[PDB]
Design an enzyme around this catalytic site. Structure first.
Site, mmCIF file in Angstrom:
data_model
loop_
_atom_site.group_PDB
_atom_site.id
_atom_site.type_symbol
_atom_site.label_atom_id
_atom_site.label_comp_id
_atom_site.label_asym_id
_atom_site.label_seq_id
_atom_site.Cartn_x
_atom_site.Cartn_y
_atom_site.Cartn_z
ATOM 1 C CG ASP A 129 -1.946 1.079 1.248
ATOM 2 O OD1 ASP A 129 -1.958 1.884 0.303
ATOM 3 O OD2 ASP A 129 -2.774 1.155 2.223
HETATM 4 C C1 LIG Z 1 -7.334 7.696 2.757
HETATM 5 C C2 LIG Z 1 -6.070 7.804 3.598
HETATM 6 C C3 LIG Z 1 -4.845 7.508 2.692
HETATM 7 C C4 LIG Z 1 -4.990 6.181 1.954
HETATM 8 C C5 LIG Z 1 -5.149 4.915 2.797
HETATM 9 C C6 LIG Z 1 -5.191 3.681 1.907
HETATM 10 N N1 LIG Z 1 -5.314 2.437 2.665
HETATM 11 C C7 LIG Z 1 -6.098 1.370 2.034
HETATM 12 C C8 LIG Z 1 -6.083 0.161 2.985
HETATM 13 C C9 LIG Z 1 -6.915 -1.054 2.560
HETATM 14 C C10 LIG Z 1 -8.054 -1.340 3.553
HETATM 15 C C11 LIG Z 1 -7.600 -1.683 4.959
HETATM 16 C C12 LIG Z 1 -7.516 1.872 1.758
HETATM 17 O O1 LIG Z 1 -8.166 2.556 2.563
HETATM 18 N N2 LIG Z 1 -8.167 1.274 0.777
HETATM 19 C C13 LIG Z 1 -9.567 1.499 0.418
HETATM 20 C C14 LIG Z 1 -9.703 2.801 -0.357
HETATM 21 C C15 LIG Z 1 -11.110 3.145 -0.848
HETATM 22 C C16 LIG Z 1 -11.512 2.482 -2.140
HETATM 23 N N3 LIG Z 1 -12.786 2.283 -2.333
HETATM 24 O O2 LIG Z 1 -10.671 2.163 -2.961
HETATM 25 C C17 LIG Z 1 -10.149 0.331 -0.379
HETATM 26 O O3 LIG Z 1 -9.499 -0.202 -1.246
HETATM 27 N N4 LIG Z 1 -11.346 -0.082 -0.010
HETATM 28 C C18 LIG Z 1 -12.017 -1.244 -0.524
HETATM 29 C C19 LIG Z 1 -12.025 -2.337 0.577
HETATM 30 C C20 LIG Z 1 -13.269 -3.168 0.780
HETATM 31 C C21 LIG Z 1 -14.181 -2.588 1.870
HETATM 32 N N5 LIG Z 1 -15.102 -3.568 2.438
HETATM 33 C C22 LIG Z 1 -16.146 -4.101 1.813
HETATM 34 N N6 LIG Z 1 -16.426 -3.786 0.545
HETATM 35 N N7 LIG Z 1 -16.917 -4.981 2.456
HETATM 36 C C23 LIG Z 1 -13.431 -0.836 -0.975
HETATM 37 N N8 LIG Z 1 -13.785 -1.134 -2.232
HETATM 38 O O4 LIG Z 1 -14.133 -0.113 -0.242
HETATM 39 N N9 LIG Z 1 -4.078 4.882 3.795
HETATM 40 C C24 LIG Z 1 -4.378 4.610 5.059
HETATM 41 O O5 LIG Z 1 -5.529 4.416 5.452
HETATM 42 C C25 LIG Z 1 -3.246 4.745 6.057
HETATM 43 N N10 LIG Z 1 -3.213 6.133 6.504
HETATM 44 C C26 LIG Z 1 -2.141 6.932 6.360
HETATM 45 O O6 LIG Z 1 -1.096 6.519 5.794
HETATM 46 C C27 LIG Z 1 -2.183 8.357 6.976
HETATM 47 N N11 LIG Z 1 -3.517 8.753 7.490
HETATM 48 C C28 LIG Z 1 -4.231 9.717 6.907
HETATM 49 C C29 LIG Z 1 -5.545 10.033 7.572
HETATM 50 O O7 LIG Z 1 -3.776 10.355 5.954
HETATM 51 C C30 LIG Z 1 -1.092 8.453 8.043
HETATM 52 C C31 LIG Z 1 -0.955 9.884 8.566
HETATM 53 O O8 LIG Z 1 -1.425 7.596 9.123
HETATM 54 C C32 LIG Z 1 -3.488 3.789 7.207
HETATM 55 C C33 LIG Z 1 -3.322 2.348 6.738
HETATM 56 C C34 LIG Z 1 -2.499 4.051 8.357
HETATM 57 C C35 LIG Z 1 -1.048 3.780 8.067
#
Ligand SMILES: CCCC[C@@H](CN[C@@H](CCCC)C(=O)N[C@@H](CCC(N)=O)C(=O)N[C@@H](CCCNC(N)=[NH2+])C(N)=O)NC(=O)[C@@H](NC(=O)[C@@H](NC(C)=O)[C@@H](C)O)[C@@H](C)CC
Length: 203
Positions: A129
């Site tokens: 990631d």
């Molecule tokens: C938005 C903040 C920046 C991007 C985000 C991307 N992380 C992935 C992690 C994977 C999940 C645990 C993400 O959220 N992915 C989402 C993004 C949204 C999207 N739609 O693409 C995703 O793929 N989500 C799928 C997952 C499935 C959900 N569940 C389900 N469908 N049942 C989805 N399609 O919703 N990074 C983070 O969340 C990290 N945050 C950060 O790096 C920073 N925090 C902030 C607030 O900037 C730092 C200051 O801590 C976390 C891990 C801490 C280290």
């Protein structure tokens, strides 16, 4: 370009005529942008992250220029903490992840970039990631001392335990650094360890 991961992979994009800054995020399925108006029709959706779910508006077939490279695809608009370019558009612009600057494995982004890691003696699957500063692992009984931390993303914050100087082998490549342990829905390898294995983004 070839982009290293010592700093957040922030780039300029153009969407709807407006310039915005966004994070190239291999850990995101979809592209999510802060509240703005897009010319046309949308539908409500819910998406999830490290700390829960949020409600967004889905727009389809939206032209987006990402550091000069053209894409046309789905953009989700809502209360994201950071504008993110996810795999749906990273694939359109030819973006891959590459180890050791290209000598090592190439990972395309058609599906989630899941790999095998070794930590505390145990083998686990984890997501590479580029949008994560830190490395976050599912509840695991690591021995040793720790400090409390809260980490954020889509859905809010979760509480984790911060351990330092933990070895983490990623696809056979040794790394050692800080690991956060808590109730994440997916094990995440973040930039703090991706840099140690020479991981770059390329398009
Ligand atoms: C938005 C903040 C920046 C991007 C985000 C991307 N992380 C992935 C992690 C994977 C999940 C645990 C993400 O959220 N992915 C989402 C993004 C949204 C999207 N739609 O693409 C995703 O793929 N989500 C799928 C997952 C499935 C959900 N569940 C389900 N469908 N049942 C989805 N399609 O919703 N990074 C983070 O969340 C990290 N945050 C950060 O790096 C920073 N925090 C902030 C607030 O900037 C730092 C200051 O801590 C976390 C891990 C801490 C280290």
């Amino acid at each position: 370009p070839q982009i290293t991961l010592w700093k957040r992979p922030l780039v300029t994009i153009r969407i709807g005529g407006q310039l915005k800054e966004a994070l190239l995020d291999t850990g995101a399925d979809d592209t999510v942008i802060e509240e703005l108006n897009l010319p046309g029709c949308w539908k409500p959706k819910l998406i999830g992250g490290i700390a829960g779910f949020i409600k967004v508006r889905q727009y389809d077939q939206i032209p987006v220029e990402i550091a000069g490279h053209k894409a046309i695809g789905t953009v989700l608009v809502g209360p994201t903490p950071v504008n993110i370019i996810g795999r749906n558009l990273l694939t359109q612009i030819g973006a891959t992840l590459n180890f050791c600057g290209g000598g090592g494995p190439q990972i395309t982004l058609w599906k989630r970039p899941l790999v095998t890691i070794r930590i505390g003696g145990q083998l686990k699957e984890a997501l590479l990631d580029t949008g994560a500063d830190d490395t976050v692992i599912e509840e695991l009984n690591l021995p040793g001392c720790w400090k409390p931390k809260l980490i954020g993303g889509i859905g809010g914050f979760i509480k984790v335990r911060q351990y330092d100087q933990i070895p983490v082998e990623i696809a056979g490549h040794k790394a050692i650094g800080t690991v956060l342990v808590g109730p994440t829905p997916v094990n995440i390898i973040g930039r703090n360890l991706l840099t140690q294995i020479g991981a770059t983004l390329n398009f």
